[PDB]
Enzyme design. Structure first.
Site, PDB file in Angstrom:
ATOM      1  N   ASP A  95      36.442  47.398   8.883  1.00 59.38           N
ATOM      2  CA  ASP A  95      35.093  47.430   8.257  1.00 59.38           C
ATOM      3  C   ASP A  95      34.657  46.037   7.821  1.00 59.38           C
ATOM      4  OD1 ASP A  95      32.658  48.613   7.409  1.00 59.38           O
ATOM      5  OD2 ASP A  95      33.566  49.474   5.602  1.00 59.38           O
TER       6      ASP A  95
ATOM      7  N   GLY B 271      30.324  54.122  -4.112  1.00 63.90           N
ATOM      8  CA  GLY B 271      29.757  54.592  -2.859  1.00 63.90           C
ATOM      9  C   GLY B 271      30.811  55.396  -2.127  1.00 63.90           C
TER      10      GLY B 271
ATOM     11  N   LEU C 221      30.931  48.235 -11.500  1.00 68.67           N
ATOM     12  CA  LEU C 221      30.357  47.213 -10.603  1.00 68.67           C
ATOM     13  C   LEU C 221      29.702  47.835  -9.383  1.00 68.67           C
ATOM     14  CD1 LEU C 221      33.205  44.571 -11.024  1.00 68.67           C
ATOM     15  CD2 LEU C 221      30.901  44.390 -11.918  1.00 68.67           C
TER      16      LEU C 221
ATOM     17  N   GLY D  26      34.527  54.902  -3.278  1.00 70.01           N
ATOM     18  CA  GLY D  26      34.997  55.278  -4.634  1.00 70.01           C
ATOM     19  C   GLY D  26      34.185  54.584  -5.738  1.00 70.01           C
TER      20      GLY D  26
HETATM   21  C1  2HX Z   1      31.551  45.586  -6.685  1.00 72.09           C
HETATM   22  C2  2HX Z   1      31.941  45.382  -5.216  1.00 72.09           C
HETATM   23  C3  2HX Z   1      32.805  46.563  -4.764  1.00 72.09           C
HETATM   24  N1  2HX Z   1      33.119  46.510  -3.315  1.00 72.09           N
HETATM   25  C4  2HX Z   1      34.249  47.204  -2.904  1.00 72.09           C
HETATM   26  C5  2HX Z   1      34.110  48.278  -2.017  1.00 72.09           C
HETATM   27  C6  2HX Z   1      35.238  48.984  -1.614  1.00 72.09           C
HETATM   28  N2  2HX Z   1      36.466  48.703  -2.075  1.00 72.09           N
HETATM   29  C7  2HX Z   1      36.598  47.660  -2.925  1.00 72.09           C
HETATM   30  C8  2HX Z   1      35.517  46.905  -3.394  1.00 72.09           C
HETATM   31  N3  2HX Z   1      35.647  45.825  -4.277  1.00 72.09           N
HETATM   32  C9  2HX Z   1      36.829  45.208  -4.619  1.00 72.09           C
HETATM   33  O1  2HX Z   1      37.949  45.536  -4.278  1.00 72.09           O
HETATM   34  C10 2HX Z   1      36.698  43.987  -5.456  1.00 72.09           C
HETATM   35  C11 2HX Z   1      37.845  43.246  -5.864  1.00 72.09           C
HETATM   36  C12 2HX Z   1      37.576  42.085  -6.606  1.00 72.09           C
HETATM   37  C13 2HX Z   1      36.231  41.720  -6.893  1.00 72.09           C
HETATM   38  F1  2HX Z   1      35.965  40.606  -7.618  1.00 72.09           F
HETATM   39  C14 2HX Z   1      35.173  42.518  -6.455  1.00 72.09           C
HETATM   40  C15 2HX Z   1      33.774  42.193  -6.781  1.00 72.09           C
HETATM   41  C16 2HX Z   1      33.337  41.993  -8.144  1.00 72.09           C
HETATM   42  F2  2HX Z   1      34.274  42.160  -9.109  1.00 72.09           F
HETATM   43  C17 2HX Z   1      31.994  41.664  -8.503  1.00 72.09           C
HETATM   44  C18 2HX Z   1      30.990  41.479  -7.505  1.00 72.09           C
HETATM   45  C19 2HX Z   1      31.530  41.761  -6.265  1.00 72.09           C
HETATM   46  C20 2HX Z   1      32.795  42.019  -5.774  1.00 72.09           C
HETATM   47  F3  2HX Z   1      33.058  42.215  -4.497  1.00 72.09           F
HETATM   48  N4  2HX Z   1      35.401  43.661  -5.733  1.00 72.09           N
HETATM   49  C21 2HX Z   1      31.997  46.393  -2.378  1.00 72.09           C
HETATM   50  C22 2HX Z   1      31.181  45.146  -2.759  1.00 72.09           C
HETATM   51  N5  2HX Z   1      29.997  44.956  -1.902  1.00 72.09           N
HETATM   52  C23 2HX Z   1      30.710  45.238  -4.268  1.00 72.09           C
HETATM   53  O2  2HX Z   1      29.965  44.027  -4.549  1.00 72.09           O
END
Ligand code: 2HX
Length: 275
Positions: A136, A16, A13, A19
């Protein structure tokens, strides 16, 4: 019991500085999950579980706030590997981060920004009440459960235990960081959070962040590029007070007249999302 046994891995997904995060499914019940990998070398902050286990701070913080309140992404499980940790988080479906949502839609209508900003405040209050400082807060770290109109905070990988003394370390997002960090490399927890929240609210109602360079953060002069009500502009400029102690407390933000009469999350999805 092992990891790749319990979880079917889907596509990447995103990746950066935080991780690499993958879509996934828990094999037992087909529950949607997100699977986050972080290399041990790129973790600087390491907490301790009650039982003395060394872990990334992120795991400590999410355990501190992972309960029934749905305003923070829930940590379902985690795993150590020889050179990395793996976190399993809940995953709403359908889902979109607030950054993509704003990119698609442009500047948010005030009614919508009010609802979203209010939920973000409730989520951040819950973290603070649980002794956790996110550090953040920004549109990329906020996700929208589109069906329910509910926002969730994600990415505690730059966060810390909340304390009342000065922080002199920071590795969150610089354009959301306050002038006292830019100038002195010092900030206190709550008032730095409130500044990032001013940046976020401006971002919501203008469709981009107000400052790009250090010198603009430090000057702190806010220009509105879109039409924004006087009460919203006032709340934004309050959150963005140059002196930390001039910034509103969370209670002051939620009692601000721009914050009154918030939509319920489900009403918000019906009016603004399903549409
Ligand atoms: C793909 C997402 C990952 N995200 C993260 C960055 C750092 N740590 C964790 C995350 N994301 C998550 O922990 C997380 C948990 C459940 C979710 F459903 C999602 C998620 C997804 F599964 C699809 C689209 C976006 C989400 F945030 N991310 C940044 C978002 N800018 C991006 O977008």
């Amino acid at each position: 019991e092992p990891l790749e046994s319990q979880y079917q891995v889907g596509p990447l997904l995103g990746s950066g500085g935080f991780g690499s995060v993958y879509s996934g499914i828990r094999v037992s019940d087909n529950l949607p999950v997100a699977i986050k990998h972080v290399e041990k070398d790129r973790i600087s902050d390491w907490g301790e579980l009650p039982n003395g286990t060394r872990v990334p701070m992120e795991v400590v913080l999410l355990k501190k706030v992972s309960s029934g309140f749905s305003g923070v992404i829930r940590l379902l499980d985690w795993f150590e590997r020889p050179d990395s940790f793996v976190l399993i988080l809940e995953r709403p479906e359908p889902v979109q981060d607030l950054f993509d949502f704003i990119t698609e839609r442009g500047a948010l209508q005030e009614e919508l920004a009010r609802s979203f900003f209010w939920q973000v405040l409730e989520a951040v209050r819950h973290c603070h009440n649980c002794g956790v400082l996110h550090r953040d807060i920004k549109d990329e770290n906020i996700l929208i459960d589109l069906n329910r109109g509910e926002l969730k905070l994600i990415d505690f990988g730059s966060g810390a235990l909340l304390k009342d003394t000065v922080y002199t370390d920071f590795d969150g997002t610089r354009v959301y960081s306050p002038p006292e960090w830019i100038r002195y490399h010092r900030y206190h927890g709550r008032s730095a959070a409130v500044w990032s929240l001013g940046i976020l609210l401006y971002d919501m109602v203008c469709g981009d962040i107000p400052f790009e360079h250090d010198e603009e953060i430090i000057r702190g002069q806010v220009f509105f590029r879109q039409r924004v009500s006087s009460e919203c502009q006032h709340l934004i400029r309050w959150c963005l007070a140059l002196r930390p102690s001039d910034r509103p407390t969370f209670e002051e933000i939620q009692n601000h007249p721009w914050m009154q009469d918030v939509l319920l999350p489900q009403e918000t999805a019906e009016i603004h999302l399903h549409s």
